[PDB]
Amino acid sequence: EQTERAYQKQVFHHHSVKRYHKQIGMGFVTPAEAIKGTYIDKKCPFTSDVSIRGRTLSGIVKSCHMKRTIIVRRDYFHYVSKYQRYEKRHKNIAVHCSPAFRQLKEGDHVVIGQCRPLSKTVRFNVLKFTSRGTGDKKQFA
Amino acid sequence: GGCDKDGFPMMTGVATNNRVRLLLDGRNGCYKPLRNGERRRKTVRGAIVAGDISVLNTIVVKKGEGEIEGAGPKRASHIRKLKKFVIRREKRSKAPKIQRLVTPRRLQHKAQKLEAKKLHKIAMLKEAKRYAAILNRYKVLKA
Amino acid sequence: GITRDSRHKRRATGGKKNSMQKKKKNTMGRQPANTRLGAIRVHDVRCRYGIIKRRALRLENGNFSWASQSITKGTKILNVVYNASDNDFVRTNTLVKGAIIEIDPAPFLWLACISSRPGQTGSVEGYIL
Amino acid sequence: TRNLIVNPLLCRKQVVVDIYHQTIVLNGFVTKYGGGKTSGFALIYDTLSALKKFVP
Amino acid sequence: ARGPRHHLKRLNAPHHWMLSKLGGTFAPKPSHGPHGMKECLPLILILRNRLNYALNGREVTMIVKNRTIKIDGKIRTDTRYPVGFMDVLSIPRTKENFRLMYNTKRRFCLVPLTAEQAKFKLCKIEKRVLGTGAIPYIVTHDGRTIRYPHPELQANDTIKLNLETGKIVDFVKFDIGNTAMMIGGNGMGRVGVIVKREVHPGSFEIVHIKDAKGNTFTTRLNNVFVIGKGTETLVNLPLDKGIKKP
Amino acid sequence: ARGLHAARKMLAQRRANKWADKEWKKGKLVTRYKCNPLGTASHAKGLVQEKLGIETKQPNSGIRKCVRVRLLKNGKKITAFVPRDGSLNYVNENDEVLISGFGRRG
RNA sequence: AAACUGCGGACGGCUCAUUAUAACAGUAAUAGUUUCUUUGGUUACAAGGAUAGCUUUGUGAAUGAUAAAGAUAAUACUUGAGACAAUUCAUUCAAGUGAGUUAGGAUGCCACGACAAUUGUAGACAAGUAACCAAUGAGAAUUUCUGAUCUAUCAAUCAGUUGGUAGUAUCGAGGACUACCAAGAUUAUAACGGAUAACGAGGAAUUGGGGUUCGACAUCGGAGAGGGAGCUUUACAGAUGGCUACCACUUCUAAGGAAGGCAGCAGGCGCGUAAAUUACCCACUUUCGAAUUGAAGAGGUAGUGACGACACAU
RNA sequence: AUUACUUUGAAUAAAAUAAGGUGUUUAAAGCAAAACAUUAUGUUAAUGAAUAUUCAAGCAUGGGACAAUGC
Secondary structure, eight states: OOOSSSOOOOSSOOOOOOOOOOOOSTTOOOOGGGTSOOOOOSSOSSSSSOOOEEEEEEEEEEEEEETTEEEEEEEEEEEETTTTEEEEEEEEEEEEOOTTOTTOBTTOEEEEEEOSOOSSSOOEEEEEEEOOOOOSOOOBO | OBOOTTSOOOBSSSOSSSOOOEEESTTTTSOOOSSTTOOEEEOOOBSSOOTTOOOBOOSSOOSTTOOOOOOOOOSSSHHHHOOTTSOOOOOOOOOOOOOSSSOSTHHHHHHTTHHHHHHHHHHHHHHHHHHHHTTTTSHHHHO | OOBOOSTTSOOTTSOOOOOOSOOOSTTBOOOOOOBEESSOEEEEEEOGGGOEEEEEEEEOEEEEEETTTTEEEEEEEEEEEEOSSOTHHHHHTOBOTTOEEEEOOTTOOOOEEEOSOTTTTSSEEEEEO | OOOEEEETTTTEEEEEEEEOOOOEEEEEEEEOTTSSOEEEEEEEOOSHHHHHHSOO | OOSOOOOOBTTTSOGGGOOOTTSOSBOOOOOSSSSOSSSOEEHHHIIIIISOOOSSTHHHHHHHTTTOOEESSSOOOOTTOEEOSSOEEEETTTTEEEEEEOOTTSOOEEOOBOTTGGGEEEEEEEEEEEETTTEEEEEETTOOEESSOOTTOOTTOEEEEETTTOOEEEEEOOSSSOEEEEOSSTTTTOEEEEEEEEEOSSSOEEEEEEOTTSOEEEEEGGGEEEOOSSSOOSSOOOTTTTOOOO | OOSTTOHHHHHHHHHHHGGGOTTTTTTTSTTTTTTOSSTTOSSOEEEEEEEEEEEOOTTOOSEEEEEEEEESSSOOEEEEEOOSTTTTTTOOSSOEEEOOOOSSOO
């Protein structure tokens, strides 16, 4: 929890120190691991001061090799007017994943939501995750 | 101070003694910024007066009317220093507009200004006090 | 001047970015003013929209606060003993947020960690560990 | 003639004079093909002071 | 552009001013104030075209600067003052008290009023916030920050304002039994009855408005403007009575 | 590849197969500004430096008069026909001549 | 009149070199920032110095050139009262909104701290000012999602590069920058690179349908002022009909030195197949200003005009 | 359980396109005007096209046949 040069403390820290956890908006239940958990994260949507604004997307988790941050691949179809046919496409989105989802792994469908720019590319935040099958390499966050 | 053989102000700050090609501007007093932030880097003259300085006109100097070749009070705390004691001048006597002795047009400055101002401020306080007073019915019955 | 746009960085794919326009004042940066330890000296920087930032160049005193006793008292800072980011800040005693500074408890009669932005607000304010 | 508008603020009357063949304004006249009928706007400023001041 | 603009090209002007495309290069840019750029009719356009008092801008400045216009209770002397919604306009010299309401043709209309009914004007609350020192206040659609309000004056109600006094006369809540006038898009300038408001947490609040003739048309909550209570109008509706003919 | 989702190949097939167009490829690849003595110009101004007589093709006998013209932009040399009958007499040397293609597009 | 002071020249006008997910179009966020003008509202019968126009003496060929001395004003520059607000930090109580240790209140020190020490005698009533809340803002600026032409004689690319923590800087998020730690990020769904005679869109030409080609140019968005760079002023400029230096040019010269930036309007040279008057007026539209009055090569009028379009002689 | 598909909207700068009206002598045009009160009066608070759209995305909703993604 405290394995760094500076003291790791929550953005909203108070005595009774307490554990602070707000809840995000349109019907996303806060996970249990973020209530009793002792992790510290200033970018977690539940236990920090990052909102969840308009845009909301979904995709398949592909890469879980960066610290508390994952890559979400969205597959869709693009329509070409001349041929009246579709074509497969994809766009990778780098999204933050708080330690509240310990069981998240590569290949699991995840619902993500917009927040303020947290990095050069990271602008979305993980909201909920549904697990899927195994592929011989269980790579967790 | 003085000019130069080519009629050039001996840039004071620049304690040199030679036409000083340098950022010329109001700062130097040898140029007027034509436009916004217009510092016309230009030659001038070194403060130190010397060899080729024509006109001299004030190094350590005074009137000496150069040498080359090498109206009254009109405010009134200051008019006092020296109404009836103002220094007029000359068939169209045109004494200046006196200011700050009480500024004898103090009838206007009392008709307006403080009494015309404090009356409204002391007024506005009561409604400020009264309007908050009728907000005691804000939560007395709503809650 | 120092710039803060992303037009000078590489893409997420590693590809270089090809410029289109010159520098602009919106993304203007400014030189750091490492507030060392010494006599009082601040400068008023005229930022955007006319607002004024107090740029503390050197400071000696700060209004430290004690959380337990609910008391805030002025004190003279002694020595910067720890910086979580750069150990070279300790050698030069540069005052930045989060710097662990030891102070004399002369008015405390009645170790510190800074919690203000001296280079932005213009003074040192902290608390007692 | 045609439409008349009463303007007190400009102290004038805006009337479209139809011709069926120092206090007035005569402008904006356009006839028909080969002459004949001609239309126009008539502005009356009553007071000479209006014409003395209310003119571009 | 390095800063705020000052000119307005004729074709970039809002469509609901009906400016001739060959009239001229520029259009009168409405100065800032109570009403937005696209929600207001500049005072010059009200007199040159709607009322035809002044033929050109030479004769518009000769009027507004002559203290001959009283926007709301106060008097304005700005040639391009933003004259927006039902904020009353009065000319004491000609003894007429107009009002700028909408109509079914997406256009600002000058509804004539009597002297008595021109002394008041309806406002729509935009938000209510608590000031420092616990001094609550509300903001109307005219940008007015009214002082200590009624405790029940919530975000999206409608209040009655007085020009002479400045107090709040009557207030209408936002419910499913009220008459509303439309300030929006397709439904712009239509009167009706609020019957249903379906809520989506994400982006917008959608309100179904039933017309007098049984026509039902939906809209966004922003465009709704309550005009009365219990199928009653507090002001004289325009000539078409807020009715739309298919 | 007629499938519903097969618009990627349906499009790549047309991009590649359009380069076999002898005429479409001509107006797209970069030789009109290098190989063409005219460029995109409708006409051209040049200087005369030789008068030529070209013998006709096999089913004809005669001498089609011509000139050798050097332009002012490229500097290349081009053989130019003389339009009408007896028009070689009116031509001279070191004079401006306007040169405008022929009936067929280059 | 002139001068100081205030406001403006950051709008308008021109051009299309740069630019290939950059810009731009629709869309969404700013609970991640925000001024100027304008609007609603809230918060000692009077002090102090100097300065221009003014006078006088001058220089230099000269610029919209500049020197000394003698004075004289403020709604220019300051002190000071008539008695809070807003900023930072630490602690704490807590109701709208989809959602906030959130608006807001309470405690303790720190910085800042006013409602001109103001103006008409006539158009008590105006007028003016300093901060702070809300509007104007759908505005500006960053940012989310989707969308672009040809090329594989371009198949692997990136090292502040991808992420984390602390700080720094900014109006503000952010590797934007710095220190430490990890090895990550993109790619056959075409990454990276190359070409463009590439500014993007609304749109134009032609079309039975499907489409193909075009768009510098009315309007909107972007960028630039010979080429880069660096800055001052102010609310907004990395301004160039502002300044500094270097690179490259042009002009005056008393030979000592000095200014200049027509991708503004006319006009000239050159270039080419290829393109108009060195005219008049702010009266229409609108903008700027101390404001009904001045200015505007914006705008209008006039001249040239077989680019085009409409009706119509012999 | 989502997506895709399809139907309604919401929202959506103008100019331009199609288009409604209107005798600029017709037409291109312009959004002006006039049947008329034989006109100051009223028609008149006159007309301003609903102007329809607009592809690829984005929001909501009615339907689940044809398709896609794992349990």
